[PDB]
Design a binder for this molecule. Structure first.
Ligand SMILES: [Zn+2]
Ligand SMILES: [Zn+2]
Lengths: 87, 144, 16, 196, 195, 114, 130
């Protein structure tokens, strides 16, 4: 599920395209998973051991990131394509 | 109170020796089982050659099933009876059965001689696989 | 396939 | 009654997103096979077997009035869950349903229609082999017909709907800003909690 | 990869055949999708089993079932199918030999493990669908030895029958000497036991 | 028994009577096409249905390992000793435990019943 | 056993081997050569064929086994059919001399023309009681 199905689920989803005017397009391409990480009150990442999750009533989960390519067309035969990495 | 206190002097148990029959009894049971399997094979061969004729009111499958079922039933109860005759008076299974305290003669036969036919919804085990009860048999095998 | 990220490549955006 | 079984027992088919079972030959004409010989070629592979032919006689007889793909598509569209008020919408809706909902594992492109037709033929062919007693009815609790959804497929099932919700949410946010004529920040669009 | 291999072989796609040729040929299904037809099913299945047993293009968990009576070859690759390993039998002989047992005795400090057993084509995973097309030996010591013949064509052989049991039923000593309701009751009670 | 198709639309030819000649004609409806119907039989249905299973048996079942094999019955077309025996196990092959036999020899798919 | 046969419901389909709708436009002739003999035995005297009988034919075979088991004879089935349908169906039956128990049916000569016989067949097989 993690290695293949998540990637295929994001990839086969329809690309978003919107208009009111400038056309906007959004596309999800690549997926990233870190290890299970805990953010403290200050917000510092640290590796979350599962025993800490058991004791502190946390959830032994890892964050999910996706590279999002936004392509905006301003009806002038130009396409500005900006790729946000690790969203 | 009185019987429970006398039983401390008498005592009552149940063990492996109460489930053991002599070698002659085992040989008789095995001979009965071999005879039953042989006559089941003869019934199967009669059915395969179209020699078996259906009884009135029953199809040919029903006739064959009735024949083999009565065959295995009489084999089972004959083996159980022979095992019952082999029981000694000190045999604790017999002591608990004749008193009616627990168990039955069928329990003694199943423990000693033959567990017997296993039935699902009042019939023999059905062909869950393609014409087979398990992958370890050949297709169209109606043996015991 | 899904790429793995080490903990050092996680920017401190979750705190901002 | 008197004339229902005079033709004989026939074959009907009930499809997704249709509020009424439709005759099978109507479905085949909708797929684009109007000739009876072409349909029976997709259904019956041995034409020298009379029994299969007598089985499929009344199904042909019921659908004989319709003799064109457009007529069959209108027939299907009239009986839809949301029927088209006009004939064009009915045919378009029936075409979409056959395109995407009827046996999608065979294919979703239009050029897979032939494959779908063959598969549909095979389906009714199996039914005929059950009707003629040439094949045993498949057993429901036969465990070869079962599958086990584990953590993998089950979490995939959830993640699909949840990713759908997330994309709908960022769609709403981006369209809120687009209708206002201004640009939107991508980070604020994503409601993370919809997954988390 | 299954579709690519079959296209490389003489499997005829449905688009490139008249319906007249379907009657005398065997239908080929892949995950329930009728891909095409094939006219020599036996050697095709021999090739597919050869590829699966070698860990070639076909992976182990792919399950192939030939319905000879209905002239169908259904290949399944999706998840959710249950299977178990069975020892392969050829000409009333196990493909497992003493050399494999010797290698497995030194499982440590040799890097010979179960996966090499699967790769050697001695043991293969069989699913309940393919079990219908399998003639299985209970134990190699007697069921396939020469005698008054019951069946001379065994395709597989069980590793040990005791593995039919689950986890809680396998801690029962001598369960074959019990009444089966009490085996079920113990399977419940071991779950409830202290430890 | 005979099933006939049109030559212009390949739709099903329905039987019809020309009473002007008192002759059966397999006529195409919605195509005004007619043929000389000479089968002279429009319906039939075997309610007794004693239909042969050797017609229905496929010779490729000789390759099945799960089936029973025997040497008691040699083949009558090649004399091969081994033969695979089984039952119909089908409705319309009504309840009867008889054995149909297939010659195990390749290229000799002889079927018979005892 | 006689009383058992008298009360146990027997329909036409129980005793029939098969049927066939022939055409046979000339009722003097038959498409089946074996039929022509006893049909001529019933056609030296006209029986509702002086006018044009319907040029279809419904020919049924009755199982000798079930006919003997249920103590049924050839004539009483025809009597039951004529009672059920009046003279709308002209029914002839072969003389009881062989296991081929043939019964021919045509529509009355005062008379769909063809599939109406199929409706009559689907009716008489199930609902009609011997
Ligand atoms: Zn025509
Ligand atoms: Zn031969």
């Amino acid at each position: 599920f993690i290695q293949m199905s998540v990637q295929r689920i994001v990839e086969d989803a329809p690309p978003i395209d919107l208009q009111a005017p400038p056309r906007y397009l959004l596309k999800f391409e690549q997926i990233y998973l870190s290890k299970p990480t805990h953010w403290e009150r200050d917000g510092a990442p640290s590796p979350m051991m599962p025993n800490e999750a058991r004791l502190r009533n946390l959830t032994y989960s890892a964050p999910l990131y996706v590279d999002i390519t936004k392509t905006v067309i301003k009806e002038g035969e130009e396409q500005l394509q900006t790729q946000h990495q690790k969203t | 109170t009185v019987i429970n206190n006398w039983l401390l002097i008498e005592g009552h148990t149940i063990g492996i020796g109460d489930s053991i029959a002599d070698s002659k009894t085992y040989q008789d049971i095995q001979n009965t089982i071999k005879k039953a399997k042989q006559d089941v094979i003869e019934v199967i061969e009669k059915a395969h050659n179209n020699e078996l004729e259906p009884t009135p009111g029953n199809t040919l499958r029903q006739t064959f099933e009735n024949q083999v079922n009565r065959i295995l039933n009489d084999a089972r109860d004959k083996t159980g009876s022979s095992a019952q005759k082999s029981l000694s008076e000190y045999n604790n299974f017999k002591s608990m059965v004749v008193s009616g305290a627990k168990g039955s003669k069928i329990n003694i036969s199943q423990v000693i001689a033959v567990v017997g036919q296993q039935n699902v919804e009042g019939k023999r085990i059905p062909f869950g696989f393609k014409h087979r009860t398990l992958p370890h048999f050949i297709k169209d095998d109606y043996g015991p | 396939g899904v790429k793995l990220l080490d903990i050092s490549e996680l920017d401190m955006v979750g705190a901002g | 009654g008197a004339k229902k079984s005079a033709i004989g027992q026939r074959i009907v088919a009930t499809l997704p997103y249709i509020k009424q079972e439709v005759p099978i030959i109507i479905v085949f004409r909708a797929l684009g096979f109007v000739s009876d010989r072409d349909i029976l070629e997709h259904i019956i592979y041995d034409f020298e077997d009379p029994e299969m032919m007598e089985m499929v006689k009344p199904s042909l007889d019921e659908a004989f009035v319709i003799q064109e793909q457009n007529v069959a598509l209108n027939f299907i569209g009239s009986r839809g869950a949301k029927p088209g008020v006009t004939k064009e919408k009915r045919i378009k809706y029936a075409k979409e349903v056959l395109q995407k909902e009827m046996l999608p594992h065979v294919g979703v492109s239009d050029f897979c229609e032939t494959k779908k037709a063959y598969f549909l033929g095979y389906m009714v062919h199996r039914l005929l082999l059950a009707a003629l007693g040439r094949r045993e009815l498949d057993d429901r609790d036969h465990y070869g017909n079962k599958r086990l959804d584990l953590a993998g497929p089950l979490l995939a099932f959830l993640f699909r709907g949840m990713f759908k919700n997330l994309l709908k949410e960022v769609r709403i946010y981006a369209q809120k800003f687009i209708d206002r004529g201004k640009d939107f920040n991508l980070e604020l669009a994503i409601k993370t909690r919809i997954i988390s | 990869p299954i579709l690519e291999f079959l296209e490389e072989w003489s499997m005829e796609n449905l688009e490139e055949i008249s319906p007249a040729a379907i009657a005398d040929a065997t239908k080929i299904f892949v995950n329930g999708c009728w891909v095409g037809i094939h006219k020599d099913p036996e050697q095709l299945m021999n090739t597919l089993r050869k590829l699966r047993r070698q860990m070639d293009i076909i992976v182990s968990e792919v399950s192939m079932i030939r319905d000879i009576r209905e002239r169908e070859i259904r290949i399944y690759t999706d998840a959710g199918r249950i299977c178990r390993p069975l020892l392969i039998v050829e000409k009333q002989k196990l493909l497992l030999k003493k050399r494999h047992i010797d290698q497995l005795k030194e499982r440590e400090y040799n890097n010979y493990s179960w996966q090499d057993l699967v790769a050697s084509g001695v043991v293969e995973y069989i699913d309940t669908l393919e079990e219908e097309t399998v003639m299985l030996a209970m134990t190699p010591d007697d069921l396939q030895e020469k005698e008054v013949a019951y069946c001379s064509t065994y395709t597989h052989c069980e590793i040990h029958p005791s593995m039919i049991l689950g986890v809680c039923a396998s801690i029962i000593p001598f369960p074959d000497h019990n009444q089966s309701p009490r085996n079920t009751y113990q399977s419940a009670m071991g779950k409830q036991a202290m430890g | 028994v005979g099933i006939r198709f049109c030559q212009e639309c390949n739709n099903m030819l329905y039987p019809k009577e020309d009473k002007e000649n008192r002759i059966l004609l397999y006529a195409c409806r919605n195509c005004d096409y007619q043929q000389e119907a000479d089968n002279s039989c429009i319906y039939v249905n075997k309610i007794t249905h004693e239909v042969d299973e050797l017609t229905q048996i496929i010779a490729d079942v000789s390759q099945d390992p799960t089936l029973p094999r025997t040497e008691d019955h040699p083949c009558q077309k090649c004399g091969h000793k081994e033969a695979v025996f089984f039952q119909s196990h089908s409705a319309r092959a009504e309840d009867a435990m008889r054995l149909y036999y297939v010659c195990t020899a390749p290229h000799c798919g002889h079927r018979w019943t005892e | 056993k006689d009383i058992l046969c008298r009360l146990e419901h027997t329909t036409l389909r129980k005793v029939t081997a098969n049927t066939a709708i022939y055409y046979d436009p000339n009722p003097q002739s038959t498409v089946v050569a074996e039929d022509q003999e006893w049909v001529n035995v019933y056609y030296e005297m006209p029986d509702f064929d002086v006018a044009r009988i319907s040029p279809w034919l419904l020919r049924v075979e009755l199982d000798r086994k079930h006919m003997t088991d249920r103590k049924l004879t050839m004539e009483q089935i025809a009597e039951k059919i004529n009672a059920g349908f009046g003279d709308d169906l002209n029914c002839i039956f072969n003389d009881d001399n062989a296991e081929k128990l043939v019964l021919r049916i045509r529509i009355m000569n005062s008379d769909d023309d063809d599939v109406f016989l199929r409706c009559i067949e689907s009716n008489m097989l199930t609902d009609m009681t011997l």
